[PDB]
Every structure is written in C-alpha cells, then in structure tokens.
Amino acid sequence: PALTKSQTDRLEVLLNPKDESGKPFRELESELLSRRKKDLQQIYAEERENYLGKLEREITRFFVDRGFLEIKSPILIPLEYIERMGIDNDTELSKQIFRVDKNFCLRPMLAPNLYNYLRKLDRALPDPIKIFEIGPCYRKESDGKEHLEEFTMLGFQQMGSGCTRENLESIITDFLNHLGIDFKIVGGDTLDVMHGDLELSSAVVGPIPLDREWGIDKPWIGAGFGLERLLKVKHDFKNIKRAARSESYYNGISTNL
Amino acid sequence: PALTKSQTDRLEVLLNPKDESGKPFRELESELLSRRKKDLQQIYAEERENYLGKLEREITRFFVDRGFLEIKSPILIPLEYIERMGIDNDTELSKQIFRVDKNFCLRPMLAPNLYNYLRKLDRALPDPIKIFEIGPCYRKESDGKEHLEEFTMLGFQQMGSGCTRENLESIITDFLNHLGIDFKIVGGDTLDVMHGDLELSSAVVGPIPLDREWGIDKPWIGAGFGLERLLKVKHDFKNIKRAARSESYYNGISTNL
Ligand SMILES: Nc1ncnc2c1ncn2[C@@H]1O[C@H](COP(=O)(O)OP(=O)(O)OP(=O)(O)O)[C@@H](O)[C@H]1O
Ligand SMILES: Nc1ncnc2c1ncn2[C@@H]1O[C@H](COP(=O)(O)OP(=O)(O)OP(=O)(O)O)[C@@H](O)[C@H]1O
Ligand SMILES: N[C@@H](Cc1csc2ccccc12)C(=O)O
Ligand SMILES: N[C@@H](Cc1csc2ccccc12)C(=O)O
Ligand SMILES: [Mg+2]
Ligand SMILES: [Mg+2]
Ligand SMILES: [Mg+2]
Ligand SMILES: [Mg+2]
Ligand SMILES: [Mg+2]
Ligand SMILES: [Mg+2]
C-alpha cells in the first residue's frame, strides 16, 4: 500500500541527496539504514573530520593567506554592544537576542567585536588593517528551513586603503569560487550575496554613520557569511539542520540509526 | 621616585614573560608599548594565526590522526542534561550554570553530548569507538587567576576494547609530550593531570554508575582538557586572561596600546 506521511518523513531523514514503488516501508528503511551506516563507517575509517570544523579550517586558511588576521573574540558579549549597534525595539533583531544574566547576551553578530579590534589594532598595525573571525552566533528564529538558533558566522573586515566596492566584490568572488559555491551579488552600500533565494551573506561598503559610535573614522569594507548555509548549498542539504552543530546529524548523516 | 602600584599594574599589562630602576614610568611604558606593537606587527606580517585557534587545529590533527572522530555538538544544551549528569544542588557546579530561557543553558562540560554520541554511534561504528570535541564551555567562577567564565575544552572518549588506565595514561602522555607541556598524573578511577598546582585535566576510567543514565553499558576511558590552561603553561602567561577569547589581549599581547 501507500507510504504514510510519517513513514515518508522517517525515510527522508535517512535519505541523502545523492541517493537514487512496490517496496514496503520496512525494506526501504532497512536499505537506507545500511547505506547511512556505511557512510559513517567510511568517514570513521578515513578522514574523520566534521564538515563544520573542516569548513572553518578551510575558510581560515583562505583569509590568513590573503593577509587577514585571525580573531577569536568573546561569544558572550555585553548587552550594551547591541544597543550601540543601533539595535532598538523598532527592529527585528531586538526580539531575537538571547539574554544572559543582567548585563550580557549571546552574540547575534560579529560586528561589535570586530569593530573594537579595528579601533585598537589601528594603533599598532600598518594600513590597511585586515581581520576576520569564525565562530558561534545566536538568534531566536521562528523559521527552521534556512535558519538555526545556534549558527556559525564568518566575518571579515578591511579598514583603510583599498576599501572599495570592487575590492569587496573581488574578495567575495574569489572566496566562493574557491569553495565551489554558485552565487550572485545583489544591491554606504549594502550588498547581499545570494544563492537562488538563499542569502549567503550581507556585505557593507563603509564608511557608515554607525562607525562613529565605535571610534572608527576610516573607510572600510566587510561581510558576514553563514557557514551552515554554505554547507547546505555545497552539500545540497534540503534542511539546514543537517549542517548544524547537532546530536541528530553528523556530516549530514542521521545519527538515529 | 618609586613606581606606584597603579603604574606597576599598567606595566605588567604590557610586560611579556620573555622581557628582561632609575627609569621613570613614562620611559618604561614607552619602551614596552614599542615592543608590543612590534610583536603585533610581526604576527600580522607573518603567520597571522590566533593562539587559541591554532592550538585547536593542532589538537584536532593529533586526535584525528590517532583514530578519533571529530565532533561538533551544540553549545546550547538542555538543562535536563545537567541534572542527568548527577549535578544537584548539593554540588558546586549547580551554582555555576549559565541558564538561558527556561529549558536551556550554556554547556559547562562536554560529557553529556559526548555520552549521546557514544550511544548513537555504537549502532553504526566498529569497536572501539573513539570521539573527541573541542569548543566553548561556560561556568560562573569566583576566581580569576586560573579560571575563566568563558573557556575552551578538549574532550575525548574511547568506548569498548582497549579502555584501560594504561591506555588512557598513554594517550595523555603522548598528547602533552606532543604539545611540549610538562605534567604529572595524580590519582571507576578518577585521575587528574597536573602542572605544578594547576589542573590541566580530569580523566576518568569507566565504567561508572552514571553510564546507565545515558544508555552506556560498555567500558570507556576519557578526559577533559582546558585549552586556555594549556596555552597559559606553554606560553608562561602569568594570568589566564592572556589566553582567553578576549578584546583585551591578542596572543598574550595587550590590545590597549
Ligand atoms: N538564524 C540563522 N541561521 C543561519 N544562518 C544565519 C542566521 N542568521 C544569519 N545567518 C547568516 O549570517 C549572515 C549575516 O547575518 P545577517 O544579519 O546579514 O543575516 P540576516 O539578513 O538576518 O539573514 P536572513 O535575512 O536570512 O534572516 C547571513 O547572510 C546568513 O547567511
Ligand atoms: N573556569 C574554567 N576556566 C578555565 N578552564 C577550566 C575551567 N573549568 C574547567 N576548566 C578546564 O576543564 C578541565 C576539565 O573540567 P573539570 O570540571 O574537571 O575542571 P574542575 O575540576 O572544575 O577545575 P578546577 O578544579 O580548576 O575548578 C579542567 O582540568 C580545566 O583545565
Ligand atoms: N550584520 C552581521 C553581518 C555583517 C555584515 S557587514 C559585517 C562586517 C563584519 C562582521 C559581520 C558583518 C554581523 O554584524 O555579524
Ligand atoms: N567533567 C568534564 C571533564 C571530563 C572528564 S572525563 C570526560 C570525558 C569526556 C568529556 C569530558 C570529560 C566534562 O564533563 O567536560
Ligand atoms: Mg535574520
Ligand atoms: Mg536578510
Ligand atoms: Mg542580511
Ligand atoms: Mg571547577
Ligand atoms: Mg578540580
Ligand atoms: Mg576536575
């Protein structure tokens, strides 16, 4: 007979994008279970690397080799940083903040910490100043197809000379062509890097009025990329949860076998 | 005249371990400022890697090469995981938890997530099962010399065959000798890896009664290492804050120049 909706959901959990009727549910499930176990066995036998960790290391190598300084800043940040970013109750992000204690929150973005590093490093480093960070960011989200509440962001910034829209688009282009990800750029200037209807990045060509609140008075360019969305596109995951920090999926493979 | 306590504090911020009277504060400060700027310039010109990120990549390579599977699990975990770990109000850790919303918290440890992966991977992977994770952990702490509220932990576990105290001590020994860190092991069995009076790790030889609550019924060995404490020892930092995710220090160098 026909597969139930619940049975189809179960199979889709076990179904990989590269997988290719009269067979009952138990046979279809048994076949997929066998395939997914072998996938995990192959990873365990060979590379043993996590997709998220591996992507972070690859992105790190890319930006270090292009002269960007690797930053590891706090994930737990002051609540005042959020207000200082021009985030008031009349914006969407104000309601998306994970508050911790009275004075802190989980960072929903990388810009405040990177802003602070630009200002401080300006007193020590030659022009131009190039920095980047990869790490966890947190936002309360209502959706679940393209959004995670716990995700990983790449953020990079260049300050001083060479901060043009052309140079920014060049870095973005080299980056995504390096990863093998198809894209289009749509758009101080605010640009969005799109994969179909999926936003991979928001990019900015400074200066912008916000800079003054952070002690920045130089031209700058930068962008923020979601690593899970990059993984989702590269590995053709139907749902972004396959690319997340998770106990339910490893490298897009269901751990409930 | 004599340096004030405040002036000495200022200098100690700028002072590096490898640095070597009648000179006034302003001269001493100016000399150190010049040295620290050059240090940052040298990093920026050459390697451009963050110590914490670099250590994580080195540790990752070590365990992957020895057959351990790289795990990236959620940092935001259910509060029930804490209770299930046998953490009640009569223990110290109960008061150290960063609570988020009503049902979640920032993980103070890696064991609950690694426990879950051991159980799930047992249905797919051959014996023995070897996994590890590196990532942020959070604990409210009263001290500040050897403790951070936001820190990074290495956790590894092996389940099944070869789970002996000897094998556990062998992995620990090879690991720390690889990093070039002096240590002594002091001590199911609970072992502590010490550097002088500083605890680098707590290690465990299972099985332990707690395993049943997590669906584990096999022998296992494992340990948890603090990456910032490893950095502190390796780079001879006087205060652990020099090794933390920070806006005040980069690779042990003050960013307030
Ligand atoms: N909840 C989330 N889950 C996964 N990735 C995210 C999330 N929020 C943002 N990102 C990624 O971070 C990048 C930069 O953050 P930004 O604030 O510009 O996103 P956004 O415009 O809020 O995204 P969206 O419009 O899709 O909600 C985005 O391009 C996206 O790839
Ligand atoms: N607050 C902290 N800051 C930095 N590192 C930590 C912190 N708490 C734990 N660690 C590291 O994690 C490892 C394993 O965690 P564990 O719970 O065994 O530590 P602990 O016994 O609470 O440490 P301590 O006794 O020093 O407070 C420790 O050996 C330590 O290196
Ligand atoms: N608004 C997001 C993404 C972003 C846009 S420009 C930019 C420059 C540096 C880091 C992040 C970003 C953030 O602040 O993380
Ligand atoms: N209690 C700490 C450290 C630890 C001891 S054995 C162990 C095995 C795996 C992961 C972590 C640990 C934790 O749960 O993270
Ligand atoms: Mg959004
Ligand atoms: Mg958007
Ligand atoms: Mg955007
Ligand atoms: Mg403790
Ligand atoms: Mg202890
Ligand atoms: Mg301990």
Numbering used by the authors:
A (entry chain A), B (entry chain A): 188 to 207, 212 to 378, 385 to 454
Quote what the paper states about this structure:
To understand how BtaRS discriminates the Bta molecule from Trp and other canonical amino acids, we determined a crystal structure of BtaRS•Bta complex. The crystal structure of BtaRS in complex with Bta and ATP was determined at a resolution of 2.1 Å. The unbiased Fo − Fc electron density map revealed the presence of both Bta and ATP in the active site of the enzyme. The first mutation, Asn346Gly, creates a flat interface in the amino acid-binding pocket, which shape complements the shape of the Bta molecule. The second mutation, Cys348Gln, enables an additional contact between BtaRS and Bta. Apparently, the discrimination between Bta and Trp depends on two other residues in the BtaRS active site, Val401 and Trp417. These residues form hydrophobic contacts with the Bta sulfur atom, which would be impossible for polar and hydrogen-containing indole imino group of the Trp molecule. Thus, BtaRS discriminates Bta from canonical amino acids apparently by four residues in its active center – Val401 and Trp417, which are also present in the WT PylRS, and Gly346 and Gln348, which were introduced in the Bta structure by mutagenesis. Compared to the 3-I-Phe bound in IFRS active site, the BtaRS•Bta complex shows that the carboxyl group of Bta shifts away from the ATP binding site, leading to an increased distance between the carboxyl oxygen of Bta and the α-phosphate of ATP. The Bta activation by BtaRS reached 2.4% of the catalytic efficiency that PylRS displays for its cognate Pyl substrate.
